[PDB]
Design a protein around this motif. Structure first.
Motif, PDB file in Angstrom:
ATOM      1  N   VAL F  21      37.205 -18.348 -88.551  1.00 16.15           N
ATOM      2  CA  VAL F  21      37.677 -18.385 -86.925  1.00 16.15           C
ATOM      3  C   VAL F  21      38.667 -19.288 -86.873  1.00 16.15           C
ATOM      4  O   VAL F  21      38.586 -20.359 -87.282  1.00 16.15           O
ATOM      5  CB  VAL F  21      36.263 -18.933 -86.462  1.00 16.15           C
ATOM      6  N   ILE F  22      39.620 -18.940 -86.129  1.00 18.37           N
ATOM      7  CA  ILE F  22      40.873 -19.562 -86.012  1.00 18.37           C
ATOM      8  C   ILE F  22      41.069 -19.680 -84.337  1.00 18.37           C
ATOM      9  O   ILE F  22      41.318 -18.731 -83.819  1.00 18.37           O
ATOM     10  CB  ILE F  22      42.414 -19.019 -86.618  1.00 18.37           C
ATOM     11  N   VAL F  23      41.661 -21.033 -84.063  1.00 19.19           N
ATOM     12  CA  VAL F  23      41.750 -21.209 -82.778  1.00 19.19           C
ATOM     13  C   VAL F  23      43.506 -21.697 -82.626  1.00 19.19           C
ATOM     14  O   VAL F  23      43.760 -23.095 -83.232  1.00 19.19           O
ATOM     15  CB  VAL F  23      41.063 -22.483 -81.867  1.00 19.19           C
ATOM     16  N   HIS F  35      44.308 -29.122 -87.075  1.00 21.56           N
ATOM     17  CA  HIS F  35      43.642 -28.689 -88.419  1.00 21.56           C
ATOM     18  C   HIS F  35      44.674 -27.880 -89.249  1.00 21.56           C
ATOM     19  O   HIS F  35      44.121 -27.154 -90.414  1.00 21.56           O
ATOM     20  CB  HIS F  35      42.450 -28.045 -88.377  1.00 21.56           C
ATOM     21  N   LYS F  59      39.583 -12.335 -78.377  1.00 21.24           N
ATOM     22  CA  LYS F  59      38.847 -12.196 -76.928  1.00 21.24           C
ATOM     23  C   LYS F  59      39.868 -12.846 -75.987  1.00 21.24           C
ATOM     24  O   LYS F  59      39.722 -12.407 -74.731  1.00 21.24           O
ATOM     25  CB  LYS F  59      37.448 -12.812 -76.923  1.00 21.24           C
ATOM     26  N   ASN F  61      41.893 -16.187 -73.885  1.00 23.76           N
ATOM     27  CA  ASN F  61      41.520 -17.092 -72.603  1.00 23.76           C
ATOM     28  C   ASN F  61      42.816 -17.567 -72.282  1.00 23.76           C
ATOM     29  O   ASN F  61      43.861 -17.173 -72.688  1.00 23.76           O
ATOM     30  CB  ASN F  61      40.365 -17.973 -73.114  1.00 23.76           C
ATOM     31  N   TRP F  62      42.702 -18.616 -71.240  1.00 28.09           N
ATOM     32  CA  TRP F  62      43.873 -19.341 -71.001  1.00 28.09           C
ATOM     33  C   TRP F  62      43.932 -20.364 -71.895  1.00 28.09           C
ATOM     34  O   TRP F  62      43.203 -21.257 -72.168  1.00 28.09           O
ATOM     35  CB  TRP F  62      43.389 -19.988 -69.476  1.00 28.09           C
ATOM     36  N   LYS F  63      45.312 -20.439 -72.648  1.00 28.78           N
ATOM     37  CA  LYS F  63      45.617 -21.285 -73.404  1.00 28.78           C
ATOM     38  C   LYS F  63      44.769 -21.452 -74.749  1.00 28.78           C
ATOM     39  O   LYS F  63      44.685 -22.462 -75.419  1.00 28.78           O
ATOM     40  CB  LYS F  63      45.915 -22.662 -72.757  1.00 28.78           C
ATOM     41  N   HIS F  64      44.000 -20.490 -74.969  1.00 27.11           N
ATOM     42  CA  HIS F  64      43.327 -20.192 -76.112  1.00 27.11           C
ATOM     43  C   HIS F  64      43.005 -18.953 -76.666  1.00 27.11           C
ATOM     44  O   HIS F  64      43.081 -18.161 -75.690  1.00 27.11           O
ATOM     45  CB  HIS F  64      41.780 -21.160 -75.693  1.00 27.11           C
ATOM     46  N   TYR F  66      40.883 -17.898 -79.973  1.00 26.10           N
ATOM     47  CA  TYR F  66      39.613 -17.670 -80.648  1.00 26.10           C
ATOM     48  C   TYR F  66      39.634 -16.250 -81.502  1.00 26.10           C
ATOM     49  O   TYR F  66      38.845 -15.428 -80.927  1.00 26.10           O
ATOM     50  CB  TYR F  66      38.530 -17.892 -79.572  1.00 26.10           C
ATOM     51  N   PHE F  67      40.443 -16.122 -82.269  1.00 30.08           N
ATOM     52  CA  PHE F  67      40.735 -14.955 -83.004  1.00 30.08           C
ATOM     53  C   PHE F  67      39.608 -14.922 -84.075  1.00 30.08           C
ATOM     54  O   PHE F  67      39.293 -15.836 -84.499  1.00 30.08           O
ATOM     55  CB  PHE F  67      42.126 -15.040 -83.873  1.00 30.08           C
TER      56      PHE F  67
END
Lengths: 98, 67, 157, 41, 138, 79, 48, 154
Positions: F21-23, F35, F59, F61-64, F66-67
């Motif tokens: 899970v990559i942010v 990280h 999915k 979002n704003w400035k994110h 969550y691939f």
RNA sequence: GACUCAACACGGGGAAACUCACUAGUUUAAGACAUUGGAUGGUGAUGCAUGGCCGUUUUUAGUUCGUGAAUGAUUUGUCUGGUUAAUUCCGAUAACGAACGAGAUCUUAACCUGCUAAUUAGCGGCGAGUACACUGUACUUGCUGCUUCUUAGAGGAACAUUGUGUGUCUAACACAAGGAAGUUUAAGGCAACAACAGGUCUGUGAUGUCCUUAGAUGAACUAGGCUGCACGCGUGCUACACUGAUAUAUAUAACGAGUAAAAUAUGCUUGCAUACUUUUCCUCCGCCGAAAGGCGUAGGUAAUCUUUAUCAAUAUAUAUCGUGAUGGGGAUAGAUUAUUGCAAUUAUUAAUCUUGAACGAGGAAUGCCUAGUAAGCAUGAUUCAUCAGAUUGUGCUGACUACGUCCCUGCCCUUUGUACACA
């Protein structure tokens, strides 16, 4: 031992827990300190566009903080608070000697 | 000031049940009304208390239309 | 080491992220609590860190994005709500509505208190925007939980 | 347009009206006679 | 021995304490005469002639003031000293004179024992004035 | 220029493989990731390419971002 | 680029990513446009 | 006129029981008579504060201010320069802009404080960082205040 | 962009870079996916494609339903009358009974529970005094019965309460008393139904459709622009003085708000790279400078340090002036010292000096207002690196006058006439 929260019923139940626990453990405890309430406010304008009558609304967040002091084991006090605490309330600890 | 139909009919519903304990005295009638009723806030509780007192002060001086 | 006011606003911002995360991801089911599936959720959250009115609104949204007749099924949703036990409900949909004229229909029933602090406390209200071939549709659903008791409720036995 | 000078009841207004003088010179004359506003002597 | 009363008139607040003594009535670290307005010195003198300097000759009344405008603390200290003398009469000196004292106080003015509830209301929207908005041009 | 070394893609692929899970944060001017000791411009030029190849999904979002890592992309991304 | 650690260029609204109408009270660092609707869930409950 | 019938027992044990307004002028006159401090020459070419925008127009303003700062030193025993500037602050007319409060010039107060320290009436200490009076100055001002009290009393 | 209320200190719009959407320009690929095919992005258009939000009708009292009753549109209920805050009630009533709206609900000011209690607050008590009284006081040091005072959890108190009256003797209203509270005690926010083709796609990766993408309508940077002016229209600040102009001094509030960057050294030759604390907020103080401003430190992530046993001003007491466009008044330009910002020229801001306009209280018209409110006086916060004359809170100084009316205006109801219905 001080507590901070946003909902007064939470601090009320948390405090009601600690006095009864203290009386059960029969240890010297200071009386419930009723700190002055600190309120946080901000005013903004409705109508995201520039048209119409200028209308503004304000907000209010009073934060509840109370103090207490006990002569008891730092481990048993944190265990009982963790047992009878909710994530909304945030609590810090300090001990006395006399 | 006037009065509203909700608390008017609230004051009509009681008395018909336990007027026996209700007397002329405003204070004891008010003490009775919280005992008998289930209103959750104080303002209209004592409002209807005063209203039942207002109906009692017209009781027993002629027909009273009800009860 | 930050001030308590800044700590409070920071946790408010974090839960502001959390609730919209719930809105984004909680689509295959209703609401079954929050965690302070689950494996990916907790991994993503920790890596980034270091009767149900909302569900009924989502169901009504999914309704229309399947491409179903609105009128036939809104009444079914209404029956579902009064079978769940609401005193009443209100669904309002605004947009193109199969035409080039913007319209709006409210589906009122039951008590449906509309103003006042008691209305704010008891009415669970949700809103949602749903895409459509030539615009979006705004859906607002309000459902009042069954009555502590409302102040207007007076009764003596 | 002022015209009064200093060259020739003790309240300054009365003295000024009596002797056709300004209030400052009237107060000076009052001091000279006796020897902002205050209670009458 | 020692009795303590409070004072709240307008925004200002005061604390009074009546104790046995020789007539030492002090406002903070100064005397009541050193307030500067003799107009308000008359106001503080008003209760004194209603009770009695002879009866005050054996009582010491300390007074503290913290906040409020000039009229606010003069009224606050007036009502605070009224309450202090009433309570200390009720407690220590005598009760028979206390009824006549309070009768005189009320028959002279009700503002002495209890102050007013008037205070500044929250400034409204619309304009600079609280109960007025900005001038508009058609 | 902005030539991206092959070791960069290798390390980022291995990192996302071992994480799952990559942010990656929508901002591109930030020098570093909390990280990831890597410049953050390349992890977009690679990630949008990979998503457009229909192997990982976001999915958003704003400035994110969550691939999320899908099941079918593992075999292709392995080598 | 020529970035600066001050002014509107230093920071922007987090959700709407615009340079206009950004409040700095209590380090909210968000635009009023979206703050109006995010206020209730943040905790900013209106009383007056 | 300046004296009024007082219906309560006074104390007169220090300066706090006497009026300020006459105290400042009387002690400025005493300072002039005793030549305790210099004028000084340098200060009489500058306005007291930025907002004043005009000369004091009394020629004894330095000595009139010195006794006032002494009064303030006793009134609460911690004195800095910010408190003095704020106390002697005045309104300032910015021309077409609205009137705004601004502080007085602090150099004259710094010089007054240095001269008072030289005279030894005031001392500096780490504890109680604000300026406070020495015991000698305290008892001297007590006796002086009692002398003024008796002079205006009988 | 927006054009009567319902645009014009509004777009939170106090613009040196960007903001910036424009201009003179310069670059970039930052064109994913399968040369080439090929999209995302877009402050480009469309609020007359929309969603949501909001401003108006609209702080008013209005809106709807079940059944009943009276080719149809429809009507009644939802009303002659009395009262009011209001279809709020009373009452008559082909209507009866409901729902929303109003009400109601909740904070502040406001009293009490000698409740419940004390940190960072207070009341004390005594441990030693600094000077005076006399058979304690103003100021200093330390600890501990207690919580009305500083504060706040819960609860109570007000309900026309009780009497003298009006009123269909019904709903209500009037006077007096107690009471902090007798207009719901006053202020607040929620604002029904319906509508505007009101504003906004320049707030959004909310948004269809049309358009652009290598010479970008994407992004970045360089100089500018909204700050320029014959003019008109508002919103505001300063005055036109003697209840005032100038100088000192005493008694003064509440809401507030506050912690991926400096400097040091090394190497190379002030600059680049490298490691060390935090410099990156308010600040108290002691000093340099009139000041602006500067140096080094107390304190504080905060009832603890600014600061709060007190931060402003209107005053206040005494002096000069003594109503003379005067000394009032500060438009105007010149000379500078300092900071803010890499950059201030379109002299940001600023201490100082010089400069010296109108203004004798204002036509026709027009705005606002009934008690802590008018008005005056300030001051906190907003955006802010710097800049309030803007906006939004707070306090001080507490007023003159009704306690009603429909004359205007604007709405509402009934009746009525219509050849109007985009009314």
């Amino acid at each position: 031992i001080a507590l901070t929260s946003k909902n007064l019923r939470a601090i009320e139940k948390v405090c009601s827990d600690i006095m009864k626990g203290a009386k059960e453990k029969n240890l010297n405890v200071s009386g419930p300190v009723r700190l002055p309430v600190k309120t946080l406010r901000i005013t903004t304008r409705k109508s995201p566009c520039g048209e119409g009558t200028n209308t503004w609304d304000r907000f209010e967040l009073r934060i509840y903080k109370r103090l207490i002091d006990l002569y008891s084991q730092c481990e048993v006090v944190t265990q009982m608070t963790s047992i009878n605490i909710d994530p909304v309330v945030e609590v810090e600890v300090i001990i006395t000697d006399s | 000031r006037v009065r509203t139909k909700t608390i008017k009919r609230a004051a009509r519903q009681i008395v018909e049940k336990y007027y026996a304990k209700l007397t002329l005295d405003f204070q004891i009638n008010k003490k009775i009304t919280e005992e008998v009723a289930i209103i959750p806030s104080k303002r209209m509780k004592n409002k209807v208390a005063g209203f039942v007192t207002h109906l009692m002060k017209r009781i027993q001086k002629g027909p009273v239309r009800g009860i | 080491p930050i001030s308590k006011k800044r700590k409070f606003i920071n946790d408010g911002v974090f839960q502001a992220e959390l609730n919209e995360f719930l809105a984004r991801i909680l689509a295959e089911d209703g609401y079954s609590g929050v965690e302070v599936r689950i494996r990916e959720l907790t991994s993503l959250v920790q890596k980034r860190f270091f009767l149900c009115a909302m569900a009924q609104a989502e169901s009504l949204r999914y309704k229309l994005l399947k491409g179903l007749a609105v009128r036939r099924a809104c009444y079914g949703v209404l029956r579902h709500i009064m079978e769940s036990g609401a005193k009443g409900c209100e669904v309002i949909v605004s947009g193109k509505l199969r035409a080039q004229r913007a319209k709006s229909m409210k589906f009122r029933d039951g008590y449906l208190i509309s103003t006042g602090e008691p209305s704010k406390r008891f009415v669970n209200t949700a809103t949602r925007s749903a895409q459509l071939k030539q615009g979006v549709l705004g859906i607002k659903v309000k459902i009042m939980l069954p009555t502590s008791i409302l102040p207007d409720n007076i009764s003596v036995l | 347009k002022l015209n009064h000078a200093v060259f020739i009841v003790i309240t300054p207004s009365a003295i000024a009206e009596k002797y056709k003088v300004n209030l400052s010179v009237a107060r000076a004359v009052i001091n000279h006679l006796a020897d902002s506003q205050k209670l009458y002597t | 021995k020692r009795v303590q009363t409070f004072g709240k008139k307008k925004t200002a607040v005061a604390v009074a304490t009546v104790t046995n003594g020789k007539g030492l009535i002090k406002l903070n670290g100064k005397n009541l005469d050193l307030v500067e307005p003799y107009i308000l010195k008359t106001k503080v003198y008003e209760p004194l002639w209603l009770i009695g300097s002879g009866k005050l000759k054996n009582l010491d009344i300390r007074i503290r003031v913290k906040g409020g405008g000039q009229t606010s603390q003069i009224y606050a200290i007036r009502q605070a000293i009224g309450k202090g003398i009433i309570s200390y009469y009720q407690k220590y000196v005598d009760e028979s004179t206390k009824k006549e004292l309070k009768d005189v106080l009320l028959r002279y003015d009700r503002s002495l024992l209890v102050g007013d509830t008037r205070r500044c209301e929250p400034k409204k929207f619309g304009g600079k004035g609280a109960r007025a908005r900005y001038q508009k041009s058609y | 220029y902005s030539y991206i070394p092959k070791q960069n893609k290798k390390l980022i692929y291995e990192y996302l493989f071992k994480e799952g899970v990559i942010v990656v944060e929508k901002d591109a001017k930030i020098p570093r990731h909390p990280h990831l000791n890597v410049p953050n411009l390349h992890i977009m030029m690679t990630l949008k390419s990979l998503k457009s190849r229909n192997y990982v999904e976001e999915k958003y979002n704003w400035k994110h971002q969550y691939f999320i890592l899908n099941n079918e992309g593992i075999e292709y991304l392995r080598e | 680029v020529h970035p600066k650690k001050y002014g509107q260029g230093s920071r922007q609204c987090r959700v709407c990513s615009n340079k206009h109408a950004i409040i700095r009270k209590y380090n909210i660092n968000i635009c009023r446009q979206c703050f109006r609707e995010r206020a209730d869930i943040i905790g900013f409950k209106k009383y007056r | 006129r300046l004296l009024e019938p007082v219906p309560f027992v006074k104390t007169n044990n220090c300066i706090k029981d006497v009026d300020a307004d006459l105290f400042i002028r009387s002690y400025a006159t005493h300072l002039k008579l005793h030549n305790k401090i210099t004028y000084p020459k340098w200060c009489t070419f500058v306005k007291t504060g930025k907002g004043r925008k005009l000369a004091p127009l009394n020629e004894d303003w330095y000595f009139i201010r010195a006794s006032s700062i002494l009064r303030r030193l006793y009134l609460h025993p911690d004195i800095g320069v910010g408190f003095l500037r704020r106390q002697f602050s005045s309104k300032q007319r910015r021309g077409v802009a609205p009137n705004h409060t601004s502080l007085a010039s602090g150099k004259i107060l710094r010089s007054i404080l240095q001269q008072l320290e030289n005279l030894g009436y005031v001392e500096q200490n780490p504890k109680k960082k604000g300026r406070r009076l020495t015991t000698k100055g305290e008892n001297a001002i007590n006796n002086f205040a009692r002398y003024i009290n008796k002079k205006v009393y009988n």
